[PDB]
Write a protein that binds this ligand. Structure first.
Ligand SMILES: [Ca+2]
Ligand SMILES: [Ca+2]
Ligand SMILES: [Cl-]
Ligand SMILES: [Cl-]
Ligand SMILES: [Cl-]
Ligand SMILES: [Cl-]
Ligand SMILES: [Cl-]
Ligand SMILES: [Cl-]
Ligand SMILES: [Cl-]
Lengths: 249, 249
């Protein structure tokens, strides 16, 4: 069953997955897609016409998730929902992404996580919603110049343009690009211990020093570098922005 | 001290405040402004050149606030800040607004509340930032036709147009107008008892039934009437919108 793959596809497939069993190929969009058993795990892999491997999706159990991911889920808005399926997704030149499919009553959500438990996105479940992501030349050029060591996890389209989700020395960084892929901003959560001394002293000498710290983000944009302290009091949240001298802006 | 008011301003002032002591007039923008002792509290009143009364700002103590307002402050993000000043503000053809000025370290905030303790707005304190609000014909017409029972409390400009804050039959409502003052939406908070039964049954049979309800708001716009349930779990918030049929949209 399924179709006969082109020889370069068959060759790339057999070279990458020598232990594959019961492979079944089909054409979906611009890719040769193969469902198969690999070391007892149901796997799907995507290849281009020329046999270039682009992605794999592996069926895993909840117990096979890294601790950081299972903990992220357990601490999430959806922790009480029933987990239906869990997957590991590897795309060409991208870091690993874990997918948890969860349901409750008449709703079903697809949760995508970094290996460190960073929620990349949450979407309504739909069948066949996971496919290859071609990295545009503009994005590879930007990564080489500005984020040389980082590893992309996802490229998402939004109204303002594109979002790059990446891991940079285990930091989950989100960069916004406009519709022409021109960089606009980068933001990430940091630990209080990592905030520069001058900024941290500003915060500790400010009105907000006694408030509960919910999170701290660095924000980089055309205007410079900023530190966003999200603090709370009586269950109300406020985000206070500090500049590089530790002054409130 | 100060300047001599035009005779129509002087007469309007004496007629409206017969017991005023130590009045001092100045001109500020398009208005004659007078500072005076009114029955033991400092008060400021604004008049047009023609002597039309536009506003008064009355110095009050925290104890003179309606209970709802002082309670709103004590439950706010700023409950721990030091109260520097409190005022009651009455503007022509508008309902009463209470202002609380609070400070901590080198920050100061101005909190404006309805008589029921609804936060109208919160802004960084700035000297003499309270001034008359000329109600445009478009807004007066809209209040007469569409919100005939309501008292307007504030008109606030925003990027999408204008925001009208009002009290309509003891419900605090916020209406959004576009830049031509054309109505876009109206929203207000409600209790579960006030929500239509079909909508509550929809929520109670949905995936979000077991989550904690933080608030429920009705939203009216060109496309219909909606119910926004802001719920939480593991400290994470999500707003679920239901239509008049009790279905999630
Ligand atoms: Ca400083
Ligand atoms: Ca229904
Ligand atoms: Cl979440
Ligand atoms: Cl960076
Ligand atoms: Cl420093
Ligand atoms: Cl401060
Ligand atoms: Cl809190
Ligand atoms: Cl209404
Ligand atoms: Cl919660």
């Amino acid at each position: 069953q399924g179709i006969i793959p082109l020889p370069p596809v068959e060759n790339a497939f057999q070279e990458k997955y020598p232990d594959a069993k019961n492979p079944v190929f089909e054409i979906e969009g611009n890719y040769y897609v193969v469902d198969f058993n690999n070391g007892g795990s149901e796997t799907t892999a995507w290849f281009t016409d020329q046999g270039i491997w682009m992605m794999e999706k592996i069926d895993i159990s909840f117990a096979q998730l890294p601790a950081a991911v299972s903990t992220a889920f357990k601490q999430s808005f959806y922790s009480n929902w029933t987990v239906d399926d869990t997957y590991a997704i590897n795309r060409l030149n991208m870091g690993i992404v874990y997918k948890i499919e969860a349901e409750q009553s008449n709703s079903e959500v697809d949760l995508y996580y970094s290996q460190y438990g960073n929620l990349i996105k949450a979407v309504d479940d739909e069948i066949n919603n996971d496919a290859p992501i071609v990295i545009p030349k503009e994005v590879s050029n930007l990564m080489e110049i500005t984020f040389a060591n980082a590893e992309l996890l996802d490229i998402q389209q939004n109204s303002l343009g594109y979002e790059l989700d990446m891991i940079d020395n285990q930091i989950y960084k989100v960069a916004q690009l406009n519709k022409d892929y021109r960089w606009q901003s980068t933001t990430w959560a940091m630990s209080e211990q990592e905030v520069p001394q001058i900024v941290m002293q500003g915060f500790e000498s400010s009105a907000y020093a006694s408030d509960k710290v919910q999170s701290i983000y660095t924000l980089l944009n055309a205007n410079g570098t900023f530190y966003l302290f999200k603090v709370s009091h009586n269950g109300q949240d406020k985000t206070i922005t500090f500049d590089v001298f530790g002054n409130i802006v």
